[PDB]
Amino acid sequence: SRIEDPQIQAHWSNINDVYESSVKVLITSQGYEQICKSIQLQLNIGVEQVRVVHRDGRVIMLSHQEQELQDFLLSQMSQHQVHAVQQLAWQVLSFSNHVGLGPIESIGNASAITVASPSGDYAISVRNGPESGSKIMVQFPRNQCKDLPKSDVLQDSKWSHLRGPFKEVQWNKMEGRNFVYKMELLMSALS
Amino acid sequence: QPLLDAVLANIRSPVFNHSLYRTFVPAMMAIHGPPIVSPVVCSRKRRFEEDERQSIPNVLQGEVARLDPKFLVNLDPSHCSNNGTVHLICKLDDKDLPSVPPLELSVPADYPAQSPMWIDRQWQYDANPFLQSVHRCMTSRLLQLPDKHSVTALLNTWAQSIHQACL
Amino acid sequence: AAPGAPRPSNSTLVDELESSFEACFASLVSQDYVNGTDQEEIRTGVDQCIQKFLDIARQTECFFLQKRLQLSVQKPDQVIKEDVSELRSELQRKDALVQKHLTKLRHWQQVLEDINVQH
Amino acid sequence: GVNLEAFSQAISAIQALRSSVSRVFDCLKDGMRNKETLEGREKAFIANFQDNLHSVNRDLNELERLSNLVGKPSENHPLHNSGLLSLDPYSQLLQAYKWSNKLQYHAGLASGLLNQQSLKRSANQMTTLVLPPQYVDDVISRIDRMFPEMSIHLSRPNGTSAMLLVTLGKVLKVIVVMRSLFIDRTIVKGYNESVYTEDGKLDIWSKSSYQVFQKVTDHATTALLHYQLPQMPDVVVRSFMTWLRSYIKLFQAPCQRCGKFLQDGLPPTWRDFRTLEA
Amino acid sequence: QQQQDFDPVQRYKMLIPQLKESLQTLMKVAAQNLIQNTNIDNGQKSSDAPLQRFDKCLEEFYALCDQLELCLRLAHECLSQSCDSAKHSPTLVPSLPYPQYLAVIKAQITCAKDIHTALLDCANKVT
Amino acid sequence: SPVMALLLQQFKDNIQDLMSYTKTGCAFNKVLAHFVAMCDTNMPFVGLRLELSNLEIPHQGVQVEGDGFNHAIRLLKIPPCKGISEETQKALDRSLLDCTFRLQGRNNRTWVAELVFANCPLNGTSTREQGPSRHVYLTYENLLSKVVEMFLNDWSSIARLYECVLEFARSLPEIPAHIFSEVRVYNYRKLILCYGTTKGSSISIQWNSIHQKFHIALGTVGPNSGCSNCHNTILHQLQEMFNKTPNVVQLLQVLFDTQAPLNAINKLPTVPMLGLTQRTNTAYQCFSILPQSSTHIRLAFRNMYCIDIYCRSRGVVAIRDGAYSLFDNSKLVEGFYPAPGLKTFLNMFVDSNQDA
Amino acid sequence: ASGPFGGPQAQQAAREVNTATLCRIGQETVQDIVYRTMEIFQLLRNMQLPNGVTYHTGTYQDRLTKLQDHLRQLSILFRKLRLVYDKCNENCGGMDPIPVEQLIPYVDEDGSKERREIVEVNKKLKQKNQQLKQIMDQLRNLIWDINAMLAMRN
C-alpha cells in the first residue's frame, strides 16, 4: 500500500491468551519521531471481527479481507504530520479538519483529510486521500507575477499582504524522500 | 458609608473652582513633590492631512481585493467617481462558460444594497435559452439571499448560479 | 529605532545562539546578592528567553535546510553518495543484528540441548 | 498550613489602601478640563471613592485568615543566631535557601516551556529501551504504592513480562499485563467479575464484563497507547496511575445530564465529563 | 524597644479601627475646609471655626498606614522564612546536636557555592 | 423544542448521485460519508453567523480560494471600541487590513482568528522584519457553542496599545541612546527593555478584561544585570503611575532616574531577620524596604529610626528625616522613636565634597 | 579546516566533499544542542536539598559531578557549531545566489509551456530487504509458540 508513501511499523504482543490477543501498530512516519500522533491499538476476536481504537474508541466491526480504513488512517497521519512539522517550524492554527467542501468527491471509502499552514507572508495547503488526489499541495506568495491590478492600482499603498491567487504547488518531481520533506518548501520563507 | 465628605465636596459645582488648589497642593507637596512628571519631549499636533482622495472608505476595496483570481473586477466610465465609486464589471474566468458581467452599484458602507441592476438585461438575456436559464436561477437565488451583501454575497451567488447552469 | 525602515545590524546567526543561551541564565548565574523575596516576576523573563531561543533556533534550522536544498540542486552527486553510505551502514547494522540474533539462538539451543534429565 | 501565602496578597491589598487615597486626591488635584458631554466626571470622583470600600474588604479578608498556629515558634530558623560570636563573621545559607527555591521555581517555568520541544529527530544518533533488570518493576510498584488509599499488587505468574492488579474504593479493579517497562494491554471489570486472585485456578484473563466497563477499558488502552513517551517509563506509569485515580468518584455529570448512557468518562484532559462527546 | 508580643495578627486587627476613624476624621476636616473656603470666596464672614490644618492629620494617617505596612511586611518575611526553613531543614531545636546542625548548614552552603561556581564556569565557557 | 420549519432537502437531494459523476476518475459508500462529513463542518459556521448577526457585517458562507478547503468567515468594519475612539478610530481604520476566522482544535469546538495591520511604527527588528504586519493570532474555546465578547475585549486591548504606540512617536533627547533596544516587537502586547548598557528592565503592557487598569511587570533579562535587578519592590506602585497617564515616555524617564538608587538600596539584605532580635525574644528584621509612593522610599532598621531617602532630580537625590512630617517639633508620627543621634552630619560628611 | 574535532558522528568522514553530510551533521548538532538544553534543565529541576534526611553527603555529591560532564558535553557542541558554520560558508561553489523563489517554479510539475551507482545500491538494498523479510517470516510465525498452548502453560 505504501512504498514512497508513509510506511507502517509492526509490534505484536509478548503474551497471548488462549483465544484473544492484541496488536500495537503505529504510523511511524519516516525519519521523524515527533509525528507519533496516530498509534492505533486493535484486539483480535475469534468468532467476530477485530476491534480497534485509534484515539477516541472508534470501534467498528468488519470481515475477513476488508480493512481499507488503514488508508484513511494513513491520510489522517499525513495530515497530523503536517501539523507536527508546522509546530516544529510560524505555526498555523489547528483547522486541519477531517472533512470539508467535498473537493474531488473524495472517492476511496470515506478517505478525507486536508490541512493548511501559512508560516510567514505565504500560505500552504495540503490534502490527501485514497487515490482521490492523494498528493495535494498548494503554495502561493503575496506579490505575484500575474494578477488583477485594474481595480487595485487606483488604491495607493500597494498591498503585498493579502494572498489572492491559489497557484497550486504540484507536489511532483520534488526532492521528497518520504513526503515528510514538505518542511523544505516551508523553509522557503525567509533567509 | 463615610459619605459626609461627598455632598459637601459636590457643593463646589459652579465656575469659581480655584480654591481647591489652596486646599490640597501644599499637603500634596509634602508627600508628593515630583518635578519629573512628563519632562520628555512632548507637543500636541492635532492633524497633518486627512482624505481618501481615491475612493470610498477603504474597507470595500480591501476586502474585495482578497477574493479569488477566478473573478476579474474593473470599473466602467466613472459616473460616480468620488462619492459612489461603485459600479463593478466582473468576468468569470474558470472551468465554466462565460457570460455578461453584472452591474454591481452599491450604496454607502451600511450595505443595504442589492447592487446589481442589469443595465443590459433585456437584449443580452433574450439571446439564448441556456443563459436565460442562468439568469432565471441567478434571480431566484438572489431572492433567497436574506439581506444580501454586495461585498461577497453577490459575486459568490452569481458564481454558484453560473456553476448551477450545467443542470 | 522602531519606525525606521533600514535595519542597521549585522554579524548574527552564529554568535546569536551563544549570546541568547548564556544571557537568559543571568537570573541564575550572577555575582550579586539575591533579595530573598520574589514571585511571579522572574517567570516572564525566562519565558521570553526560551521564546527568542527557539526562534533563533528555527531560524538556524531554516537556514541549514535552505543550504542543503541549494547544494542538492547544485551538487546531486554528494546527496547520492550520502544516501549510498547511509544504505551501506543500514545494511551493515541489519547484518550485525541478524548475526547477534543467530548467535543468541545458537547459544539458547546449545545450553538446553539436554534439557531432559533422564529416562 | 500554607495559608500564610494568602497574607502576601493582603500585603498588596494594603498597598492599594495607600494608592487609593492618592488616586482620590490626584482626582481632586484638578477640575473639569472639558466635560462637554455630561457631569459624570464628578461621579468619576465618587468612583475613586468607591474603591476605598476595598479597604474595608481588607478587614474582611482576615475572617478567612488565621487558621491555626504551629508549635515551636520561630521555626528553628534563628537557632544559628544562638551561636557565639565565632559563628557570626552565616546568613549566606538562608540566601541560598531562597536561591535554591528560585532554582526550582525557575525550572518550574523552564521545564514547563520545555514542553514545546524541538527534537526534529530521535534516532540515527546512537538503546535497549526494554529495562534489563527485573528489579525496576518492583521499584515502579513501590513508587505507585507510595500513593495513599490506592493499593497495588502483582504476582507475574506468566513469566518475564509484568502482571499486576490494582483496586480502588469500588470493586472496579484493573488488571494490567504489560511488557518489562511500559504499560500496555490492560483490562478492567467490577464486583468480582474478574476475581483475578484465584480465578478458576489463578489470575485468569476472561476478557469480559457486563457491557459497562468495556468503554473504560478501551479508553485506558487508548491512554496507554498515547502516553508512551520515548523515555522515562516511570513518568509514563505515574501518569497512568494519575489517570486511573480520576475515576475514584464517578459522581459528577457535566455538559450533559446523567441519563445519556450507561456511564460517562473520558478524562485525558485531566477532567472527566459526559462520554460519547469527544 | 516595643515589646508587642511579636504577634502581628491581633496588632493589625486592633489597628484597623485607627485607620478607619482617621480616614473619617480627615474626610470630615477636608469637608470643613471646603465649606470654609466656599463661604470665603463668595459668601460672608460665616466660617469662624478653627479646625485642623489638614496637614498634620493627613500626614499622621500616612504614617500609621506606613507603620502597619512595615509590620505586615515583617510578618510576611517571618512566615516565608518559617515556610522555607520547614521545607528545606529538619527539626532540631532543643534530634541532632547543634554542632552537627552547623556542620550540615556549612556543607549545604559549600554545595550551593559549588553549584554556583559550576554554573558560572558554564556561562563563561558559553561566552 | 422540535421546530416545524421547512426542510425542503436543501442539499443536492437527490441529484447528489450526479455529483459522484462530476469526478475526474467496489462500494459506493464514498457518497454517504460526504453528507455525514459536510454537516460536521458546515452547521457550526452558520451558528457563528447568528452570533455575528448582532455586531456588524454578517458576511457568511465565503470560501477562501476554494483550494484552501476551509469555510471562510472574514470580518468587515470591526465595530468601534467604547474606549478612546474620538481620534484613535481613524488610525484603527487606516490600519485595518485583511482579517478572518477559521475553525481549530479537533475541529469540534475551537475558534481561531487571524489579523494583520498596516505599517506598524513599533515594528523594530529581530522578528523577521517585514513592511506589513506579519500576523496577529487569537484563539478561543467555549463550552456551549459567546466568543464575540472575548474577541471584542482583545480588540479593545490591542486598540489601547495601538493608541499608546501612536502616542510614542517622538524623539527623546538623550534616553534613546540607552544601538536602539525595542526588539520586543508588538504582536499583541508591547514590551521594552533598553537599560543597563544592553537589554534590561523588561516592561510589560497589556489589558486584562478582569478590570480596567493595565498590567506592568519588571523584567530580569540582561547578562550584566543583578541577581534579580528587577523593580518589583516598587513595580506595583509604578503601575498605578502609568494608570495615571499612558505616556510611556514618563515611565521610561522615571525608571531611568530611579534605577541606580533602588539598585543601591536593594543591595543591602532586607528579607532576612539577621538572627534573633537585638533586644529580646521578639522577632525583628534588619531592613524593611518601603514602597509607600512612586519615588519616595523610607527604609527602616530594627523597626525604628527609618530615614527617608529618595530621588526626584535628573542626577541627584535627597535625604530627610522620616519623623518630622512637615512639622519641626510640634508632634510626632505616632510610631518609631525620632531623631536618632545625628544623621544630617553623617550624610553631609560624604554627601558632596566637590559641590560648592 | 573543517574536520573531526570531536563530533559524535556515526560514519560521516567530514571531508572536502559531501557538503550535504556537513549540513545534515550541523542540523543534527543544533537539534541535539537544544535537546541537551532541555535535558540539563530537566536534571537541574529536581535538585533536592543537599542536606538529605538519610543521605548526608553521599548521593548528590556524585550526581552534581555528573552534571558537570553534561555541561562539558554541551560545551564542545558549541565548538562544533562553529566548525560546521565555517564549512557551510566555505564551499561556495556553483550558483552562489541560487534563488529559491525561482526554484519554486522549477519544483512545480509544469507551467503549461551518473545514477548507475544509485540504482546499484537501490537494488542491493531491495535484495537485502527481501532476504531480511524471508529470514523474518520463520521467527515471525513461530513467535507465539505458547499462545495456543496457554491452557497448560503454567
Side-chain angles (χ1 to χ4, degrees), chain B residues 30-35 39 47 50-51 58-60 62-63 66-69 109 111 149 152, chain F residues 58-59 62 65 74-77 87 90 93-94 96-97 99-100 114 173 249 253 257 292-293 296 312:
Chain B
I31 173 66
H32 299 71
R47 302 290 166 87
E50 56 183 0
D51 191 289
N58 50 16
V59 306
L60 196 141
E63 290 306 319
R66 203 194 197 175
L67 265 297
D68 50 58
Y111 303 138
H149 298 323
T152 43
Chain F
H59 49 302
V62 193
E65 77 183 1
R74 319 199 181 286
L75 202 158
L76 168 58
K77 197 212 170 187
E87 62 95 19
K90 185 174 75 173
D93 285 76
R94 288 299 186 173
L96 164 56
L97 192 43
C99 78
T100 187
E114 195 177 29
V249 307
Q253 178 75 283
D257 290 28
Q292 52 81 32
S293 89
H296 206 151
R312 83 189 177 184

Side-chain angles (χ1 to χ4, degrees), chain F residues 157-162 167-169:
Chain F
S157 196
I158 54 165
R160 301 261 192 161
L161 271 291
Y162 195 25
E167 261 286 289
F168 177 83

